[PDB]
Design an enzyme around this catalytic site. Structure first.
Site, PDB file in Angstrom:
ATOM      1  N   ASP A 133       5.217  36.366  31.759  1.00  0.00           N
ATOM      2  CA  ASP A 133       4.704  37.714  31.932  1.00  0.00           C
ATOM      3  C   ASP A 133       3.205  37.770  31.597  1.00  0.00           C
ATOM      4  OD1 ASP A 133       7.648  39.657  31.110  1.00  0.00           O
ATOM      5  OD2 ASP A 133       7.385  37.543  30.663  1.00  0.00           O
ATOM      6  N   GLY A 206       8.569  37.269  38.793  1.00  0.00           N
ATOM      7  CA  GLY A 206       7.867  38.262  39.573  1.00  0.00           C
ATOM      8  C   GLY A 206       6.425  38.475  39.173  1.00  0.00           C
ATOM      9  N   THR A 323      11.962  43.482  27.780  1.00  0.00           N
ATOM     10  CA  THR A 323      12.869  42.376  27.469  1.00  0.00           C
ATOM     11  C   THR A 323      12.098  41.174  26.953  1.00  0.00           C
ATOM     12  OG1 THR A 323      14.640  43.058  28.953  1.00  0.00           O
ATOM     13  CG2 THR A 323      14.425  40.694  28.608  1.00  0.00           C
TER      14      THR A 323
HETATM   15  C1  LIG Z   1       9.412  42.615  18.645  1.00  0.00           C
HETATM   16  C2  LIG Z   1      10.332  43.474  19.531  1.00  0.00           C
HETATM   17  O1  LIG Z   1      11.351  42.995  20.024  1.00  0.00           O
HETATM   18  N1  LIG Z   1       9.806  44.666  19.849  1.00  0.00           N
HETATM   19  C3  LIG Z   1      10.482  45.613  20.740  1.00  0.00           C
HETATM   20  C4  LIG Z   1       9.774  45.758  22.094  1.00  0.00           C
HETATM   21  O2  LIG Z   1       9.739  44.456  22.743  1.00  0.00           O
HETATM   22  C5  LIG Z   1       8.352  44.053  22.872  1.00  0.00           C
HETATM   23  O3  LIG Z   1       7.793  44.901  23.915  1.00  0.00           O
HETATM   24  C6  LIG Z   1       7.790  44.508  25.239  1.00  0.00           C
HETATM   25  C7  LIG Z   1       7.335  45.574  26.267  1.00  0.00           C
HETATM   26  O4  LIG Z   1       7.846  45.562  27.400  1.00  0.00           O
HETATM   27  O5  LIG Z   1       6.731  46.545  25.746  1.00  0.00           O
HETATM   28  C8  LIG Z   1       8.680  43.514  25.698  1.00  0.00           C
HETATM   29  C9  LIG Z   1       9.232  42.511  24.646  1.00  0.00           C
HETATM   30  O6  LIG Z   1      10.580  42.928  24.387  1.00  0.00           O
HETATM   31  C10 LIG Z   1       8.431  42.588  23.340  1.00  0.00           C
HETATM   32  O7  LIG Z   1       7.151  41.974  23.379  1.00  0.00           O
HETATM   33  C11 LIG Z   1      10.653  46.650  23.014  1.00  0.00           C
HETATM   34  O8  LIG Z   1      11.678  45.782  23.556  1.00  0.00           O
HETATM   35  C12 LIG Z   1      11.084  47.903  22.318  1.00  0.00           C
HETATM   36  C13 LIG Z   1      11.720  48.964  23.202  1.00  0.00           C
HETATM   37  O9  LIG Z   1      10.755  49.415  24.153  1.00  0.00           O
HETATM   38  O10 LIG Z   1      11.603  47.749  20.993  1.00  0.00           O
HETATM   39  C14 LIG Z   1      10.723  46.981  20.104  1.00  0.00           C
HETATM   40  O11 LIG Z   1      11.315  46.871  18.816  1.00  0.00           O
END
Ligand SMILES: CC(=O)N[C@@H]1[C@@H](O[C@@H]2OC(C(=O)O)=C[C@H](O)[C@H]2O)[C@@H](O)[C@@H](CO)O[C@H]1O
Length: 363
Positions: A133, A206, A323
């Protein structure tokens, strides 16, 4: 209908759902809004409708003050992606606030931690880990900046980032690429011999192919990686298309395991593949015969993953929520959400690139 019709329907639906102060994560500079608004600004370019430009500009202006100051997560590649909106905003307005903010994000590259051969850690919290990503989060921005400010060292930086991800995550068997690689081999998902996560997760691939498809044209003419990234995109797209679902035209959350009953067709990855295939055809990187794959994807996308609500909202469903790198069971267990912004951005971008090929189909 025509691709732009659906693109406008989704964009207006989301603009009607959130004020820029609400666009989630609210009052944060982040790639979720950055990719949606890349989409909306692309839509602005396609249609000339100023409301699209204005909404994007209002989000930027919410986060960037009079002096170009911006708060963001200073260790994340994810923080850099929304900077892509700064180039069309600056170009239109000439307001130096946007170049100042851009320089703050560009300055981040020299502060981030790196693997031993120089690849950026995805975040400080993901030491020695490269996730696919991050090529989209950090690569296109860097090349836009390079062209705006004539800093050729950024070409070199993106060439290196991409070569390292491809060196470590490309699977020679299928031609697909694993989601993440841990040089330190400390994460539970890291393969003891290769450092890679175990699965081909569609959205991450993607972002990679969207990135290649967009970055080739930003390189200097005759740059050696024009040939390299074209070739890479061609093989990746051939690999991906082998896994297209014959019945719906779409792709699975875990790309190569569509027969598994706990797998499912996921929309944001499918839209990213559509984008990269359409963009690749439009730019001449891909044989035009991919248009059938593309139109089949388009028909199934609309038919199976979209609808209009009783209240008139346009809805794109089955977009994977945010994710991380992980295992099969984690990926297929991710929540499937409607109109999540990264998926809405991928949808809108796909439509803008598809529009010309749709219009000229048959000719
Ligand atoms: C550390 C963790 O798992 N944080 C969670 C968020 O995940 C981060 O954010 C992103 C993103 O798409 O913003 C993806 C990856 O999961 C990670 O770098 C997210 O999953 C969140 C719900 O939006 O919860 C956090 O705790």
């Amino acid at each position: 209908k025509s691709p732009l019709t659906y693109a406008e329907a989704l964009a207006n639906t989301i603009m009607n759902t959130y004020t820029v102060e609400e666009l989630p994560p609210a009052n944060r500079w982040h790639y979720h809004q950055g990719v949606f608004l890349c989409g909306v600004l692309r839509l602005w370019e396609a249609t000339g409708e100023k409301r699209y430009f204005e909404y994007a500009k209002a989000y930027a202006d919410l986060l960037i003050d009079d002096n170009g100051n911006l708060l963001f997560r200073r260790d994340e590649l994810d923080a850099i992606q929304a900077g892509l909106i700064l180039f069309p905003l600056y170009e239109q307005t000439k307001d130096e606030r946007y170049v100042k903010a851009a320089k703050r994000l560009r300055s981040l590259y020299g502060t981030l931690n790196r693997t031993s051969e120089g690849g950026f850690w995805h975040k400080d919290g993901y030491p020695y880990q490269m996730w696919l990503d991050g090529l989209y989060m950090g690569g296109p921005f860097a090349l836009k900046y390079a062209n705006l400010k004539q800093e050729t060292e950024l070409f070199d930086q993106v060439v290196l980032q991409e070569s390292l991800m491809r060196k470590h995550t490309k699977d020679a068997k299928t031609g697909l690429f694993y989601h993440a690689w841990d040089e330190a081999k400390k994460m539970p998902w890291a393969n003891e011999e290769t450092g890679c996560s175990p699965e081909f997760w569609a959205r991450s691939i993607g972002w990679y192919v969207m990135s290649l498809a967009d970055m080739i044209e930003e390189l200097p003419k005759k740059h050696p990686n024009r040939h390299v990234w074209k070739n890479t995109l061609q093989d990746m797209i051939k690999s991906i298309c082998r896994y297209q679902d014959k019945e719906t035209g779409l792709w699975y959350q875990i790309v190569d395991k569509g027969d598994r009953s706990d797998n499912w067709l996921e929309s944001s990855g499918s839209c990213l593949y559509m984008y990269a295939i359409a963009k690749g055809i439009n730019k001449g990187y891909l044989d035009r015969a991919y248009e059938t794959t593309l139109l089949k994807a388009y028909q199934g996308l609309i038919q199976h993953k979209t609808e209009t609500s009783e209240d008139g909202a346009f809805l794109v469903k089955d977009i994977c929520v945010g994710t991380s790198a992980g295992f099969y069971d984690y990926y297929v267990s991710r929540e499937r959400s409607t109109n999540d912004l990264h998926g809405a951005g991928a949808f809108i971008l796909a439509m803008t690139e598809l529009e010309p090929l749709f219009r000229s189909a048959g000719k």
